[PDB]
Design a binder for this molecule. Structure first.
Ligand SMILES: C[C@@H]1O[C@@H](O[C@H]2[C@H](O[C@H]3[C@H](O)[C@@H](O)[C@H](O)O[C@@H]3CO)O[C@H](CO)[C@H](O)[C@@H]2O)[C@@H](O)[C@H](O)[C@@H]1O
Length: 138
């Protein structure tokens, strides 16, 4: 569903991830959550073009790709962490030609350069772990 979709969320991307296709994810970080993952995948149990993994313990926002069975180099730098315990957030993920552009609460969060060059093969949004979703638009 689009409203209050329960976790784990699996949503098919109609014609694959178009360049300029934006995904909106509104949710809530439970006060006793450890971590949640937003995964843009090549199907079920295939490559993850972008893995976004807020971790409540260290307050990190890890980005990586799982490609050909293996994790790449993590990217961690941010200017703000909107995923604090008990906080609501509004995410905007826009698939660019050369990078994802992610905003949280209207504010730039990070860019993630494409490691999977052919992003259009991304056909599955996956959201997992310790998160409550109010709204997901794909
Ligand atoms: C030990 C391992 O940790 C998790 O899995 C994820 C992985 O953890 C990294 C960790 O962030 C890093 O400090 C260390 O050097 O390597 C670990 C293994 O790759 O990070 C990726 C993204 O890079 C994903 O978040 C993985 O889920 C964890 O849940 C495993 O069960 C395991 O305990």
């Amino acid at each position: 569903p689009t409203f209050n979709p329960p976790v784990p969320y699996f949503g098919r991307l109609q014609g694959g991830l178009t360049a300029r296709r934006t995904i909106i994810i509104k949710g809530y970080v439970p006060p006793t959550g450890k971590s949640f993952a937003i995964n843009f995948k090549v199907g079920s149990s295939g490559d993850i073009a972008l893995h976004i993994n807020p971790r409540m313990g260290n307050g990190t926002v890890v980005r990586n790709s799982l490609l050909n069975g293996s994790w790449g180099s993590e990217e961690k730098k941010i200017t703000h962490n909107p995923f604090g315990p008990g906080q609501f957030f509004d995410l905007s993920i826009r698939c660019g030609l050369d990078r994802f552009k992610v905003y949280a609460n209207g504010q730039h969060l990070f860019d993630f350069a494409h490691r999977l060059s052919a992003f259009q093969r991304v056909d599955t949004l996956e959201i997992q772990g310790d998160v409550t979703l109010s709204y997901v638009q794909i």
